[PDB]
UniProtKB/Swiss-Prot annotation:
One of its GO terms (biological process) is cellular response to insulin stimulus. SUPFAM superfamilies: MFS general substrate transporter. Electroneutral antiporter that translocates urate across the apical membrane of proximal tubular cells in exchange for monovalent organic or inorganic anions. Involved in renal reabsorption of urate and helps maintaining blood levels of uric acid. Mediates urate uptake by an exchange with organic anions such as (S)-lactate and nicotinate, and inorganic anion Cl(-). Other inorganic anions such as Br(-), I(-) and NO3(-) may also act as counteranions that exchange for urate. It catalyses: urate(out) + (S)-lactate(in) = urate(in) + (S)-lactate(out); nicotinate(in) + urate(out) = nicotinate(out) + urate(in); urate(out) + n chloride(in) = urate(in) + n chloride(out); orotate(out) + nicotinate(in) = orotate(in) + nicotinate(out). This is Solute carrier family 22 member 12. Changing residue 382 to M: In RHUC1; uncertain significance; no effect on urate transport; no effect on its localization to cell membrane. One of its GO terms (cellular component) is brush border membrane. The chain crosses the membrane at residues 7-27, 141-161, 169-189, 190-210, 227-247, 255-275, 345-365, 372-392, 401-421, 429-449, 460-480, 489-509. Changing residue 279 to G: In some gout patients; uncertain significance. Gene3D superfamilies: MFS general substrate transporter like domains (1.20.1250.20). The gene is SLC22A12. Glycans are attached at residues 54, 97.
C-alpha cells in the first residue's frame, strides 16, 4: 500500500492538519472522562438544623462555633458529624466544662430534614444535588463504575462495527453521540437518568478513542507513524491541564458538563472533511472508493500529479493483497488462528495492566498537595515528558524492550513504595511521580505496538478487546483497595505485581520495528514464517 502514500504524500499538509484536529478532540474527550473529579466533588456537609438554618431565629451572644456545637454532635472525623444531629438542642453542652458522656447517641437523630453543603469551592455538584452522602455515599463511585462499564461495552460493540463499516463513519457518529449524551447528562432530572446518559456517553467515548488513533496510523508514512501516534497520546496529557483550567473557571456542574460537551458538535461537523481509510477500503474490496479518498488526500497535499492514479494503477498495485480477503472474519478468529492467539493473549494482558494500575496512580498523586486543580494539572505535567521519553526510546530501541521497561518501571515503583516509611516523604513523592511516568509511557507503547501486531482486517477488533480489558481492570481497581483490612501493604503488592508480571510477559511478544503493517491474517502467519 505504501507506494500509494508515497504518490499521495505520507507526511504533509493533510497529515499535519489531521493530527492537529484529532488531537484536540482527544483533549476534550479527556475532559469528559476526568470530569467526575469536579462534577461529583463531595463538599463538606452537615444536617439542616433549626438553630443554624432558620433565618428568622432570635439573636444571642453566642458565637457560630458555639451555636453549631449546640446542635451538631462531634464525629469520628475529629469534626462536626456529617450524618447526625441532636434530637433537642443541647443547652447543657455550652459549658466548656461539659463532657461527651453527657449525651446518649439515642439523643441524636439522622438528617431527616436534609443536608447543608459547603459552597466555598463549588457552587453545586451531583453529590449536593441528589444527596449522594451518608448511607447513600456508595452512589458516587457507582457513577464512575457505570461510566467505565459504558466504555467497556462501547469498545466491545464499536470494535467489530469499526472493522465492518469503516473507521471514519463510526468516528463521526461517535462524535455526535458524545455531544448529544453529554448535553443530555447536563440537564438530567434524576440520578438514574444521569447514569443512563453517562453510560451512553461512554459508549461513544470508546468509539472515538479507538478510531482516532487507528485512522491516524493508517494514513501516515512509516517514519512518521510513531510521532503521530505520540501526539495523539499527548492529547490526553493536555486534556488534564484543560480539565484543570476549565473546572477552575466554571463551578456549576451543569454548566461545566454542558461546556465540555458543546465542542463535540464542532468535532462532528469537521469530521466530514476527513477521508475514509483508503487502506481499509482497498482491503474490503472497494478500490473504486479508495481511489476517491486517495485523490482527495492528494488534492489536500497539493499534488497536481494525482492523474497518475487510476483504478488501473491502484488495482495493479493491490490485487494480490485483495485476493486474500474473500472470506469473512470475526473476533473468534483472533482465538482460533495459530499465530493471532498468542499476540492476543499477551496484548490483552498488557492493556489490562495499564488500565488496572493507571487510575490508582492518578489518585496516589493527589497526596502531593492541597489544591485540587493544581493536582489535576500535575497529572498532565508529569505525563508530557514521560511520553516524549517514550517516543525517544521507542524510536531508538524498538517497541518490545520499550514496553517491557516502561511497565517494569511502573510496577517496581509501586512495589518500592511498600518499603519506604512516611518519614521519607520526599522519596515516596518521587516514586509516585516515576510510577505515573511509567504507566503513561506504557500507554504510548501499547497504543503503537498493539496496532502494528494485528492485521488491517481485524485491527480494530483487537484494539477493542484491549480497551475492554483496560476498562475491566479500571473497574477492578477500586475493589482491590478493600484488601487493606488484612494489611496496608497488600493492595500495593497486588497493584504492583500485575504491571511487573505483564511487563515481563511483554518480552515474549514479537518485535515489529522496520516491518510493514500487516493487512491480512495470511500476513500474520507469513511473518512467523
Ligand atoms: O495518558 C492517559 N491519561 C488518561 O487519563 C487516560 N484515560 C484513558 O482512557 N487513556 C489515558 N491515557
Amino acid at each position: 500500500f505504501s507506494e500509494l502514500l508515497d504518490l499521495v504524500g505520507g507526511l504533509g499538509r493533510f497529515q499535519v492538519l489531521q493530527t492537529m484536529a484529532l488531537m484536540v478532540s482527544i483533549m476534550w474527550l479527556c475532559t469528559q472522562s476526568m470530569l467526575e473529579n469536579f462534577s461529583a466533588a463531595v463538599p463538606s456537609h452537615r444536617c439542616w438544623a433549626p438553630l443554624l438554618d432558620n433565618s428568622t431565629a432570635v439573636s444571642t451572644s453566642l458565637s457560630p462555633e458555639a451555636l453549631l456545637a449546640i446542635s451538631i454532635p462531634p464525629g469520628p472525623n475529629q469534626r462536626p458529624h456529617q450524618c447526625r444531629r441532636f434530637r433537642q438542642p443541647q443547652w447543657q453542652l455550652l459549658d466548656p466544662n461539659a463532657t461527651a458522656t453527657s449525651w446518649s447517641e439515642a439523643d441524636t437523630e439522622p438528617c431527616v430534614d436534609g443536608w447543608v453543603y459547603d459552597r466555598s469551592i463549588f457552587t453545586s455538584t451531583i453529590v449536593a444535588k441528589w444527596n449522594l452522602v451518608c448511607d447513600s455515599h456508595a452512589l458516587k463511585p457507582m457513577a464512575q463504575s457505570i461510566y467505565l462499564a459504558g466504555i467497556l461495552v462501547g469498545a466491545a460493540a464499536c470494535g467489530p462495527a469499526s472493522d465492518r463499516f469503516g473507521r471514519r463513519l463510526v468516528l463521526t457518529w461517535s462524535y455526535l453521540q458524545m455531544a448529544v449524551m453529554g448535553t443530555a447528562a447536563a440537564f438530567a432530572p434524576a440520578f438514574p437518568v444521569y447514569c443512563l446518559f453517562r453510560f451512553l456517553l461512554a459508549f461513544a467515548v470508546a468509539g472515538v478513542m479507538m478510531n482516532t488513533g487507528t485512522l491516524l496510523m493508517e494514513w501516515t508514512a512509516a517514519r512518521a507513524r510513531p510521532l503521530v501516534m505520540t501526539l495523539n497520546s499527548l492529547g490526553f496529557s493536555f486534556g488534564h491541564g484543560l480539565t484543570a483550567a476549565v473546572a477552575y473557571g466554571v463551578r456549576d456542574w451543569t454548566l461545566l458538563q454542558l461546556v465540555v460537551s458543546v465542542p463535540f458538535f464542532l468535532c462532528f461537523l469537521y469530521s466530514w472533511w476527513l477521508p475514509e481509510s483508503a487502506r481499509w477500503l482497498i482491503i474490503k474490496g472497494k478500490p473504486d472508493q479508495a481511489l476517491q479518498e486517495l485523490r482527495k488526500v492528494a488534492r489536500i497535499n497539493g499534488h497536481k500529479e494525482a492523474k497518475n492514479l487510476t483504478i488501473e494503477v491502484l488495482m495493479s498495485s493491490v490485487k494480490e493483497e485483495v485476493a486474500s480477503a474473500k472470506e469473512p472474519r470475526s473476533v473468534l478468529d483472533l482465538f482460533c488462528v495459530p499465530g493471532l492467539r498468542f499476540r492476543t493473549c499477551i496484548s490483552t494482558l498488557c492493556w489490562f495492566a495499564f488500565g488496572f494500575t493507571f487510575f490508582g496512580l492518578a489518585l496516589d498523586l493527589q497526596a502531593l498537595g492541597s489544591n485540587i486543580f493544581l493536582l489535576q494539572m500535575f497529572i498532565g505535567v508529569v505525563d508530557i515528558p514521560a511520553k516524549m521519553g517514550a517516543l525517544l526510546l521507542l524510536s531508538h530501541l524498538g517497541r518490545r524492550p520499550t514496553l517491557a521497561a516502561s511497565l517494569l518501571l511502573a510496577g517496581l515503583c509501586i512495589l518500592a513504595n511498600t518499603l519506604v516509611p512516611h518519614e521519607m516523604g520526599a522519596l515516596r513523592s518521587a516514586l509516585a511521580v516515576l510510577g505515573l511516568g511509567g504507566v503513561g509511557a506504557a500507554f504510548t507503547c501499547i497504543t503503537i505496538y498493539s496496532s502494528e501486531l494485528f492485521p488491517t482486517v481485524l485491527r480494530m477488533t483487537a484494539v477493542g478487546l484491549g480497551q475492554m480489558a483496560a476498562r475491566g481492570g479500571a473497574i477492578l481497581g477500586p475493589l482491590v483497595r478493600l484488601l487493606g483490612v488484612h494489611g496496608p501493604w497488600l493492595p500495593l503488592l497486588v497493584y504492583g505485581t500485575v504491571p511487573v508480571l505483564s511487563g515481563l510477559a511483554a518480552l515474549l511478544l514479537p518485535e515489529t520495528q522496520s516491518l510493514p503493517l500487516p493487512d491480512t491474517i495470511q500476513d500474520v502467519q507469513n511473518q512467523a514464517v
